[PDB]
Short mmCIF file of C-alpha atoms in Angstrom, two decimals:
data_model
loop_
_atom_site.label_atom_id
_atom_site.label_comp_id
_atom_site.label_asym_id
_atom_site.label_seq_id
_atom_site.Cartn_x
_atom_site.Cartn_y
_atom_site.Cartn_z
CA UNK A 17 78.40 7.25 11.49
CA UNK A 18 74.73 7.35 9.91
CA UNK A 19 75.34 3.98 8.53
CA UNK A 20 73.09 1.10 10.11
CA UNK A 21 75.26 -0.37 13.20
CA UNK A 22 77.43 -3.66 12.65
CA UNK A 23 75.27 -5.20 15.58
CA UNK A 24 72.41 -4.69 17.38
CA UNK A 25 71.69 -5.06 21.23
CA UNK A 26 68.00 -5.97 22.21
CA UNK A 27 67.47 -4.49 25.31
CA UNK A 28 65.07 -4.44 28.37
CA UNK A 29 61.17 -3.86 26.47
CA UNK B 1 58.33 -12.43 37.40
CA UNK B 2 61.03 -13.87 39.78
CA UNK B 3 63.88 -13.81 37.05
CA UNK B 4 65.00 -10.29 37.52
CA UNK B 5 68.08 -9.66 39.05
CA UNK B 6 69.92 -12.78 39.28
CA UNK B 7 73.36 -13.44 40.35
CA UNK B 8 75.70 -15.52 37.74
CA UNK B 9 75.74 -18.07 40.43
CA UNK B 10 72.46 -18.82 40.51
CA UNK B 11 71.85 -18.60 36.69
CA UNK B 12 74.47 -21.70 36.66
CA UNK B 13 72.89 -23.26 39.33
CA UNK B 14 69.63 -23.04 37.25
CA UNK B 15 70.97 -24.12 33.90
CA UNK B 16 72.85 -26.78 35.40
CA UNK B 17 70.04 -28.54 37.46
CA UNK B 18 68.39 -31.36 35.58
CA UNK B 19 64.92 -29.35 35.45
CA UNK B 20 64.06 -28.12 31.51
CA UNK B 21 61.77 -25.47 33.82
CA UNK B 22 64.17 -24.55 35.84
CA UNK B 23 66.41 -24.33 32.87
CA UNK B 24 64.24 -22.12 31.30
CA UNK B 25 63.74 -19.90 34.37
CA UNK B 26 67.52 -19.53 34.82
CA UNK B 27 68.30 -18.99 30.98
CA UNK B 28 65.08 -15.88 30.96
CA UNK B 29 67.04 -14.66 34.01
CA UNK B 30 70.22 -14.27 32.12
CA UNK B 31 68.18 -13.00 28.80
CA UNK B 32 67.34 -10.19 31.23
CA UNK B 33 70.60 -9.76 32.90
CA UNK B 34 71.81 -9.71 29.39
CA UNK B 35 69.81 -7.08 28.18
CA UNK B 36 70.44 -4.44 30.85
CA UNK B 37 71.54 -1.03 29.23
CA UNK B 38 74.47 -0.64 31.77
CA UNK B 39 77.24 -2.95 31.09
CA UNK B 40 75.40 -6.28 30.86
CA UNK B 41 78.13 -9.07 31.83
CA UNK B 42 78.84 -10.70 28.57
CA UNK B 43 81.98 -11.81 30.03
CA UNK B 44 80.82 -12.80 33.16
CA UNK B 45 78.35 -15.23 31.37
CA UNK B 46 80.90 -16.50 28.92
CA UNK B 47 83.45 -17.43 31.75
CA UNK B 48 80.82 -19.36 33.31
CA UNK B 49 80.68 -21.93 30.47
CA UNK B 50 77.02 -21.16 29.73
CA UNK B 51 77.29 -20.40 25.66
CA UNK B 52 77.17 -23.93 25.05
CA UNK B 53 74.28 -24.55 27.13
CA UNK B 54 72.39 -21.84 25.01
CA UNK B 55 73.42 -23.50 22.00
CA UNK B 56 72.08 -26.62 23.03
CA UNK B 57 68.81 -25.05 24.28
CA UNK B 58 68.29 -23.74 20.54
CA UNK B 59 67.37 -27.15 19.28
CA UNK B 60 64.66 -27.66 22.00
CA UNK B 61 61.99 -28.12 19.62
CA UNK B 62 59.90 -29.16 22.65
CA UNK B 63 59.95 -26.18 24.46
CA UNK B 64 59.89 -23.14 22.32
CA UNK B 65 60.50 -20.66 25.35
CA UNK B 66 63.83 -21.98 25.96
CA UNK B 67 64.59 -21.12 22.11
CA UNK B 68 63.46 -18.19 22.78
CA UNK B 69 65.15 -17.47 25.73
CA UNK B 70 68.56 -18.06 24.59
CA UNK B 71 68.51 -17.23 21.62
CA UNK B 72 68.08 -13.18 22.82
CA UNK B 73 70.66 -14.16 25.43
CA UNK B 74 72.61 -15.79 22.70
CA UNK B 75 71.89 -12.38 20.04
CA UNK B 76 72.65 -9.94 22.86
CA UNK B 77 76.20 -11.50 23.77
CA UNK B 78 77.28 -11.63 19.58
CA UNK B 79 76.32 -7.64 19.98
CA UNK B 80 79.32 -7.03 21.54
CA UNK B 81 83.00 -7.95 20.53
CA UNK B 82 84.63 -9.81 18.26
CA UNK B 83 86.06 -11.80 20.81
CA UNK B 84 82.48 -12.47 21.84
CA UNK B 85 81.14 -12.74 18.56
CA UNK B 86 83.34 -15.16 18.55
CA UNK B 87 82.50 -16.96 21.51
CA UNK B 88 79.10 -17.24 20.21
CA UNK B 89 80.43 -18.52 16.93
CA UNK B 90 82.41 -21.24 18.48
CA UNK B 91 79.85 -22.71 20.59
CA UNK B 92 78.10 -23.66 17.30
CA UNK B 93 75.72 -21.00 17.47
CA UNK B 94 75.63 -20.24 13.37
CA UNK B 95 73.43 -23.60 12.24
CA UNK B 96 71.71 -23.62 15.65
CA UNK B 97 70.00 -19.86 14.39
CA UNK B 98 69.85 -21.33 10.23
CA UNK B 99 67.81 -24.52 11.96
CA UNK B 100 65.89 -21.92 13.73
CA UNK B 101 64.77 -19.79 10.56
CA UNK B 102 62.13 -22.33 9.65
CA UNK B 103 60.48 -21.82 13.33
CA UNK B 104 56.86 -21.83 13.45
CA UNK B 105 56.86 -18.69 15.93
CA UNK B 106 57.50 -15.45 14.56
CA UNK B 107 59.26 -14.51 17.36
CA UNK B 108 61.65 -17.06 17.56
CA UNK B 109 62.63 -17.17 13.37
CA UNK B 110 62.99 -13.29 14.42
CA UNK B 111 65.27 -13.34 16.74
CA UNK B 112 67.35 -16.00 14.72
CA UNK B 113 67.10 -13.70 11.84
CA UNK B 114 68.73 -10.75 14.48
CA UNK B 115 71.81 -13.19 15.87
CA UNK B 116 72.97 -14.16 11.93
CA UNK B 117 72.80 -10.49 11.80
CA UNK B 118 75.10 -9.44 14.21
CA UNK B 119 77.52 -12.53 13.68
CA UNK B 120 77.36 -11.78 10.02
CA UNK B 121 77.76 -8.22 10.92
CA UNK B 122 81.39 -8.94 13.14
CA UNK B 123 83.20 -8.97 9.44
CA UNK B 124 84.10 -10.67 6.09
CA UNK B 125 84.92 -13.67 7.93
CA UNK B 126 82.00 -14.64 9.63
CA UNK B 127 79.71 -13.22 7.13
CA UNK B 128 80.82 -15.83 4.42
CA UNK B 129 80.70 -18.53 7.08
CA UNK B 130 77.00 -17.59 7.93
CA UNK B 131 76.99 -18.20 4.09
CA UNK B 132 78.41 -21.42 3.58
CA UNK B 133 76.18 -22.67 6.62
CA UNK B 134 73.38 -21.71 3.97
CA UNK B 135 71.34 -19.28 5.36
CA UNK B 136 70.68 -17.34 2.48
CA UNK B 137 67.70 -19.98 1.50
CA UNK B 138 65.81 -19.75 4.78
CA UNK B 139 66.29 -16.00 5.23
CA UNK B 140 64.88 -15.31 1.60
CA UNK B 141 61.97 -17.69 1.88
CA UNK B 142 60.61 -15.86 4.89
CA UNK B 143 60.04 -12.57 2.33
CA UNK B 144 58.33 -15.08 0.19
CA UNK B 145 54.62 -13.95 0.79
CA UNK B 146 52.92 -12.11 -2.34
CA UNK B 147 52.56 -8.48 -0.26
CA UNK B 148 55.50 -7.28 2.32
CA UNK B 149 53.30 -5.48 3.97
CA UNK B 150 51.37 -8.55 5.69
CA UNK B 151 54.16 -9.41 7.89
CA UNK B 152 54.94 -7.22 11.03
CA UNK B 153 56.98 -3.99 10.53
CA UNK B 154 59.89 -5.13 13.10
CA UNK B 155 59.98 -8.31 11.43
CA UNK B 156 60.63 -7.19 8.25
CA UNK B 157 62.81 -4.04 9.55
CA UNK B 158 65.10 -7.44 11.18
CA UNK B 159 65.14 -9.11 8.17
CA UNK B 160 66.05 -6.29 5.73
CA UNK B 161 69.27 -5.26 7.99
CA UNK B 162 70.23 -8.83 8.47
CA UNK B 163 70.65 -9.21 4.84
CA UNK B 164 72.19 -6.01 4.14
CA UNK B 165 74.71 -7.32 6.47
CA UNK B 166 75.39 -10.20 4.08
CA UNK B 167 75.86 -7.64 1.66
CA UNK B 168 78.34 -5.39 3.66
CA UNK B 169 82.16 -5.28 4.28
CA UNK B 170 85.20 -5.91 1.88
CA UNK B 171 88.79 -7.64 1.74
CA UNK B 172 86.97 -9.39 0.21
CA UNK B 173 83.66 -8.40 -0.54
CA UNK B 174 80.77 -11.33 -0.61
CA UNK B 175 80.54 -14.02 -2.71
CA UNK B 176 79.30 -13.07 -6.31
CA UNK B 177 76.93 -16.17 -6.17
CA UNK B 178 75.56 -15.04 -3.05
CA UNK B 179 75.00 -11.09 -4.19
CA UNK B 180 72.78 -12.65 -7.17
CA UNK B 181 71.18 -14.72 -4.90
CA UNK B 182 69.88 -11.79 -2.54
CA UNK B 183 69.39 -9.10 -5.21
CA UNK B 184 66.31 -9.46 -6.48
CA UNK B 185 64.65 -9.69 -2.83
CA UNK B 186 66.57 -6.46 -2.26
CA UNK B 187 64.56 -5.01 -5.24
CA UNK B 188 61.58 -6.18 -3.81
CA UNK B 189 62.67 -4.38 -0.65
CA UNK B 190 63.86 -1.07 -2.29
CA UNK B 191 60.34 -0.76 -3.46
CA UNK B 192 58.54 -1.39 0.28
CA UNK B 193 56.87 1.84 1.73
CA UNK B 194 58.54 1.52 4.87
CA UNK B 195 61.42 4.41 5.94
CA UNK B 196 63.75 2.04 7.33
CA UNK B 197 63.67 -1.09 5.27
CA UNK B 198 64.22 2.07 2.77
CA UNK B 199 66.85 2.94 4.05
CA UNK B 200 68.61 -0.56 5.19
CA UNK B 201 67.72 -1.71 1.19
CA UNK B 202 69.50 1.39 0.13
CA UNK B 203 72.91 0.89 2.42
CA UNK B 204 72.84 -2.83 1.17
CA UNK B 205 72.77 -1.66 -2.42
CA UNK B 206 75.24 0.80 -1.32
CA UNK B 207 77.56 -1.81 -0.05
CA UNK B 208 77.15 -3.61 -3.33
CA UNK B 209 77.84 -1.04 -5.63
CA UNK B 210 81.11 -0.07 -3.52
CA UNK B 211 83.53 -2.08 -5.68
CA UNK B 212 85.12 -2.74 -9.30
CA UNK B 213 82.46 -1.89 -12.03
CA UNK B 214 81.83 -5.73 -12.34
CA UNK B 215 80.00 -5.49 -9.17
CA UNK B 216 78.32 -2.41 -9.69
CA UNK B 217 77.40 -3.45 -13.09
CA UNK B 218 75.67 -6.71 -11.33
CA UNK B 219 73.53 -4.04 -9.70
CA UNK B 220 73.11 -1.72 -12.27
CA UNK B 221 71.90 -4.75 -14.62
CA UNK B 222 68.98 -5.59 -12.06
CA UNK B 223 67.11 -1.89 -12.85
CA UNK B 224 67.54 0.09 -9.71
CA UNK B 225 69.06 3.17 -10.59
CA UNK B 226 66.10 5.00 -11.14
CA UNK B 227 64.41 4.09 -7.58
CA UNK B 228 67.86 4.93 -6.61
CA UNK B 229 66.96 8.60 -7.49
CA UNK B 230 63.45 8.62 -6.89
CA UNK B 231 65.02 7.82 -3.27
CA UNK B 232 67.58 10.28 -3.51
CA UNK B 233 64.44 12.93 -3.49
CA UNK B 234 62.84 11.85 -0.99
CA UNK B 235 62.13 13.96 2.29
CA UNK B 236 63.59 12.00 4.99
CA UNK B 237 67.88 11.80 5.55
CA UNK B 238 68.23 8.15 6.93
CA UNK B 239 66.51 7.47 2.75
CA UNK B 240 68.76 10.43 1.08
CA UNK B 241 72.38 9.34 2.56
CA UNK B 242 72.67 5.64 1.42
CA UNK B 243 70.75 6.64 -1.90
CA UNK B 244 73.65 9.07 -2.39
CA UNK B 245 76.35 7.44 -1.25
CA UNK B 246 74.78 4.15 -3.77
CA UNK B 247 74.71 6.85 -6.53
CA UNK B 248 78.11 8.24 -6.09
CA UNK B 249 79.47 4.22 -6.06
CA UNK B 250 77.59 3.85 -9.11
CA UNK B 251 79.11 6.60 -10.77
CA UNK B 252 82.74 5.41 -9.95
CA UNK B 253 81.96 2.97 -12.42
CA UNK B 254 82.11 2.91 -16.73
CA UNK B 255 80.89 6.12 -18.48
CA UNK B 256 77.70 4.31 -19.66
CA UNK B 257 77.05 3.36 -15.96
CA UNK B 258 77.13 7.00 -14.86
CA UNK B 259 74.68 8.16 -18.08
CA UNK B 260 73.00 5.08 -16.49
CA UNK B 261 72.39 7.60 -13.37
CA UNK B 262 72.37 10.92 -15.62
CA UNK B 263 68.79 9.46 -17.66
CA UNK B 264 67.58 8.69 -14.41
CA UNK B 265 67.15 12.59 -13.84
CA UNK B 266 69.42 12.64 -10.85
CA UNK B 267 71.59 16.05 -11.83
CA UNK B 268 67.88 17.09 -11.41
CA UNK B 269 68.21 16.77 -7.86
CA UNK B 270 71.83 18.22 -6.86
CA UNK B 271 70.96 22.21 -6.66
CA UNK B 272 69.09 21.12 -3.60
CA UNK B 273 72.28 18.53 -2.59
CA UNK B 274 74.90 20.77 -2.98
CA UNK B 275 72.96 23.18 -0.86
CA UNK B 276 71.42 20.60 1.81
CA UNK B 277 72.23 21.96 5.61
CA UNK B 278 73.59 18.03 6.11
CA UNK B 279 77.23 18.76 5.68
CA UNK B 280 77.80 14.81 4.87
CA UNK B 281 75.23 14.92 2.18
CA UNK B 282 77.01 18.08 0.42
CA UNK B 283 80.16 16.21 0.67
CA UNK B 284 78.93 13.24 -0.42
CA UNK B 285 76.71 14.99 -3.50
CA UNK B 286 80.27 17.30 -4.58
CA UNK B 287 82.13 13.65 -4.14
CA UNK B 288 79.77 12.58 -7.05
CA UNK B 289 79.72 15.69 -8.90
CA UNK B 290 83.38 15.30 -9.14
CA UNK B 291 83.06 11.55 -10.14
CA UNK B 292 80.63 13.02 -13.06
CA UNK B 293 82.69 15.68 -14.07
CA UNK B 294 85.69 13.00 -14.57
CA UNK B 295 83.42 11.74 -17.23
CA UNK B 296 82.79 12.52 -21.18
CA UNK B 297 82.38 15.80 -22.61
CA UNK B 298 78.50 15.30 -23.43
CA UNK B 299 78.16 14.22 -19.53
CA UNK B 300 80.11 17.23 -18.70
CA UNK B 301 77.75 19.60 -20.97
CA UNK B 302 74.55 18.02 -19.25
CA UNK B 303 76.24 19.59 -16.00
CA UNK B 304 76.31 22.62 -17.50
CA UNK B 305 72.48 22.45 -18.83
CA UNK B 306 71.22 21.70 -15.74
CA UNK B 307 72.70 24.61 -14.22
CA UNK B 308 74.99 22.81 -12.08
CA UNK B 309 78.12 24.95 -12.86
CA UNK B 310 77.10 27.84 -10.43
CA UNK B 311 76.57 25.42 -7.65
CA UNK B 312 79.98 23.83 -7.72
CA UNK B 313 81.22 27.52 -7.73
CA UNK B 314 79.03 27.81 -4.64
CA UNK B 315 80.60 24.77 -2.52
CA UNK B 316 83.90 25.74 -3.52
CA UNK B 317 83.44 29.24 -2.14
CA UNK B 318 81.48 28.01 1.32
CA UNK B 319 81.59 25.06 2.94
CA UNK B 320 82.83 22.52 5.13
CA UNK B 321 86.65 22.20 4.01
CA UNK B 322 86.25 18.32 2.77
CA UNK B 323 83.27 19.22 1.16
CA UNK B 324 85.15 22.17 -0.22
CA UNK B 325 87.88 19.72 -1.24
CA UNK B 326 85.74 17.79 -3.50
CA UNK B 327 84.87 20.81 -5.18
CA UNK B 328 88.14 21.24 -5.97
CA UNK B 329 88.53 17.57 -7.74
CA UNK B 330 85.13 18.34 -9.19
CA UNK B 331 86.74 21.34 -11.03
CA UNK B 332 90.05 19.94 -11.45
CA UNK B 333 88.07 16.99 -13.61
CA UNK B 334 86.06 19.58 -15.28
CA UNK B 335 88.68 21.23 -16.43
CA UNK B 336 90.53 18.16 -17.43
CA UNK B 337 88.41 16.52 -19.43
CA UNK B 338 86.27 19.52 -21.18
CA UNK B 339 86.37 21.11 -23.86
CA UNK B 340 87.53 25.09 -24.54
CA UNK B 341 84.16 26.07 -24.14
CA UNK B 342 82.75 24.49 -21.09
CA UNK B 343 86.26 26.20 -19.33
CA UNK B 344 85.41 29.53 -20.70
CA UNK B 345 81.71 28.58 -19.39
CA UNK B 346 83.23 27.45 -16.08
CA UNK B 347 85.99 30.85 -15.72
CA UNK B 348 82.72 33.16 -16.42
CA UNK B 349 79.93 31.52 -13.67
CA UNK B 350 82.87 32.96 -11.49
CA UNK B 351 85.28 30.16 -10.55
CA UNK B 352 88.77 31.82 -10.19
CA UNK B 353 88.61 33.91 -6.90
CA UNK B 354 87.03 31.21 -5.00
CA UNK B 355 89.86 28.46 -6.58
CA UNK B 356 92.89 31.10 -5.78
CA UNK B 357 91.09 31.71 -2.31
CA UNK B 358 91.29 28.08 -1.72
CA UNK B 359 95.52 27.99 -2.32
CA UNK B 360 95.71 29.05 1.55
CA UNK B 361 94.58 26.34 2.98
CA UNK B 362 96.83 24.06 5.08
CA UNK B 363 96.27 21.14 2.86
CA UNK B 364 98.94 20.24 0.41
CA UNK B 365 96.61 17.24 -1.51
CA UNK B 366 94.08 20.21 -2.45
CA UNK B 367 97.19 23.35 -3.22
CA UNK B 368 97.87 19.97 -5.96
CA UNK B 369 94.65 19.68 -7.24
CA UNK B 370 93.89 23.38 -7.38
CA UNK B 371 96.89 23.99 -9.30
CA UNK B 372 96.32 21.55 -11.76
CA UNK B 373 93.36 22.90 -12.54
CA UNK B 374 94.58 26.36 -12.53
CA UNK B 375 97.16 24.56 -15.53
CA UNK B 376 94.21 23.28 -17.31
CA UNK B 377 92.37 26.66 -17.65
CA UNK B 378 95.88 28.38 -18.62
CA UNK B 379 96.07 25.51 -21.06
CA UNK B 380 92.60 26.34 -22.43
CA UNK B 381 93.37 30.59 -22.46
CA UNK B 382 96.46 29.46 -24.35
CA UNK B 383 94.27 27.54 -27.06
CA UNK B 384 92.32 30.86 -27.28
CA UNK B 385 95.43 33.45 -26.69
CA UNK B 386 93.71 34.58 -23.58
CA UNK B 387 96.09 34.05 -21.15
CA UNK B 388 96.91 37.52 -20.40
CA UNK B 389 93.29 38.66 -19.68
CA UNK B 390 93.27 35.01 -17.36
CA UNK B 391 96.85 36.06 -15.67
CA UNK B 392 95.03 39.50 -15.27
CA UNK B 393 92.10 38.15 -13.56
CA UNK B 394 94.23 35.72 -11.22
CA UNK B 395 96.37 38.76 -10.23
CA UNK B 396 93.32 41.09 -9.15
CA UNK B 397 91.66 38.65 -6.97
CA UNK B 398 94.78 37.78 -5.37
CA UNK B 399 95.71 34.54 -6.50
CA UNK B 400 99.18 35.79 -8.09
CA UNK B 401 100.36 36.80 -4.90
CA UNK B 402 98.94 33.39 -3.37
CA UNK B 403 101.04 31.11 -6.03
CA UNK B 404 103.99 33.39 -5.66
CA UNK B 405 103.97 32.23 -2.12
CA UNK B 406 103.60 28.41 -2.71
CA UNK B 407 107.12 28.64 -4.55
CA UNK B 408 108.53 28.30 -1.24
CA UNK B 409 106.43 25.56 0.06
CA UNK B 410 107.90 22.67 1.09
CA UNK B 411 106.33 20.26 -0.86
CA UNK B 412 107.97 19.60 -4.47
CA UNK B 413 105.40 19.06 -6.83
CA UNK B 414 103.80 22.65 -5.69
CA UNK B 415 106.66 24.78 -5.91
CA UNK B 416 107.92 23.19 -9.00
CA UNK B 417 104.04 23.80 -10.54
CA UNK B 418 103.95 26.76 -8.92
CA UNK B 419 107.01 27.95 -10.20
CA UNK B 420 105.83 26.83 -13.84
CA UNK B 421 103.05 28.73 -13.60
CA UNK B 422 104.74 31.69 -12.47
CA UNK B 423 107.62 31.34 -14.81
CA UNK B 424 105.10 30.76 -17.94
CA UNK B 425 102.35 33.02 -17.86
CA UNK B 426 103.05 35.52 -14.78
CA UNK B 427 106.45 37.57 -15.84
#
């Protein structure tokens, strides 16, 4: 919800 | 750059072609293929056997690109699934990243630092093998510079999430030995002027505290409490919702770990709580208003003094219906556990009509509760031989014709209370 995400995807910079 | 756009095809072709450059150019081509924001073909690339490859180009010490390289390729496929995750795991991937903590570029430690992060962050599982693999060590001796603020933001942003997802899930919860371990760095953190290690610290400490009181006592013991309500004031919402929901764990916990929170001077902060326009954070704030009033008479009278009575009267007349519902317990514990005078306190800031207004809802959980309470106050009139004027005041606002009704409700336990109350006090 507004809890930090269980993974994170780096995506295009 | 000629890496954008590649097919899978040529991407094997690339990895596969005895060239460490043309390695590299073919691993940066799926980095970027990878990192796409519309479906990037994490399953494509795991069919095609290349996970292993990746792996092995993480020990390149030689050539620090290709570490680079996959290890975002590498970070972006554990993102996804468990079943990916998984992939990731099982190609070795977990002391591959450890080995790569004590890199001598940033960037590279970094991203290492991001893929134990999301493996760790699949589940219980994989977050105690990142564990045993011992990355705790590396990870903590990366913070170990005399000021925080000398190493880059993102870097330390990466970091502090990574190791509040060492700290998260349950069933079962981390390893004790490990929690000690990290705490004190999480301290350190939970004192760093930046918003979101703030608030990553906070949901770690959160995650900690969300357990038996053996746990929470292991963070209680370290000091926090009162930066946890210093935090709970502060202006910006990603800082006040894990503060709160740490609080609230915190006061799940042993009577003397909730005065723990009360000294702190956090009931000094709920009038503005139990009115904040964040419907989650008045839940969550009534939640631990209702964990407090469960607690000792004195804790119940500092309620009162700080004015707190009227509030909960407030929430329970307007607001969101599970917010509204935790009112409800919050009252239902007052009234439980006070004494004679904090009820009488508690009938006079006003709380009948909204508590009898409640006993229409559709929610059979909360008709219990209410009623129960409703018992307790009649229980309290009795001990003062007021429980005429209280039957009086029920009946005007409409509540007797409300619990009249619930005799016929299908549920047992309310008709039968229902029926008590009725039967005892309304005849």
């Amino acid at each position: 919800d507004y809890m930090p995400s269980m993974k994170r995807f780096r995506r295009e910079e | 750059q000629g890496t954008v756009n590649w097919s899978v095809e040529d991407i094997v072709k690339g990895i596969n072609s005895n060239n460490l450059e043309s390695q590299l150019q073919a691993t940066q081509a799926a980095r970027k293929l990878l990192s796409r924001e519309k479906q990037p073909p994490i399953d494509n690339i795991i069919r095609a056997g290349l996970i292993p490859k990746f792996v092995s180009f993480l020990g390149k010490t030689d050539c620090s690109p290709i570490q680079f390289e996959s290890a975002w390729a590498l970070t972006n496929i554990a993102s996804g699934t468990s079943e990916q995750t998984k992939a990731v795991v099982d190609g070795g991937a977990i002391p591959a990243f450890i080995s790569l903590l004590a890199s001598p570029h940033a960037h590279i430690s970094e991203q290492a630092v991001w893929a134990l992060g999301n493996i760790a962050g699949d589940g219980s599982a994989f977050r105690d093998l990142v564990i045993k693999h011992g990355a705790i060590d590396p990870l903590l001796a990366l913070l170990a510079v005399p000021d925080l603020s000398t190493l880059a933001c993102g870097y330390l942003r990466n970091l502090t999430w990574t190791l509040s997802n060492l700290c998260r899930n349950k069933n079962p919860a981390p390893p004790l030995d490990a929690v000690e371990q990290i705490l004190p760095t999480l301290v350190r953190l939970l004192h760093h002027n930046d918003p979101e290690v703030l608030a990553d610290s906070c949901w770690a400490i959160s995650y900690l505290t969300d357990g038996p009181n053996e746990r929470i006592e292991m963070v209680v013991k370290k000091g926090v409490v009162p930066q946890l309500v210093k935090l709970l004031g502060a202006t910006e919402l990603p800082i006040v919702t894990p503060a709160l929901r740490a609080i609230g764990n915190i006061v799940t916990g042993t009577d003397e770990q909730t005065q723990k929170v009360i000294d702190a001077g956090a009931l000094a902060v709920f009038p503005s709580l139990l009115t904040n326009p964040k419907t989650n954070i008045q839940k969550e704030a009534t939640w631990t208003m209702s964990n407090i009033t469960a607690g000792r008479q004195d804790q119940i009278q500092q309620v009162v003094n700080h004015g707190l009575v009227p509030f909960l009267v407030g929430v329970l007349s307007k607001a969101d219906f599970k917010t509204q519902k935790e009112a409800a317990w919050a009252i239902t514990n007052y009234t439980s556990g006070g004494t004679v005078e904090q009820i009488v306190y508690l009938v006079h800031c006003g709380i009948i009509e909204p508590l009898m207004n409640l006993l229409s809802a559709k929610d059979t959980k909360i008709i219990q509760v209410i009623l129960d309470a409703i018992s307790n106050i009649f229980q309290a009139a009795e001990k003062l031989g007021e429980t005429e004027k209280l039957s009086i005041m029920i009946e005007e606002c409409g509540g007797l014709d409300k619990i009249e009704a619930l005799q016929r409700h299908e549920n047992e336990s309310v008709y039968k209370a229902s029926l008590n109350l009725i039967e005892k006090y309304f005849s």
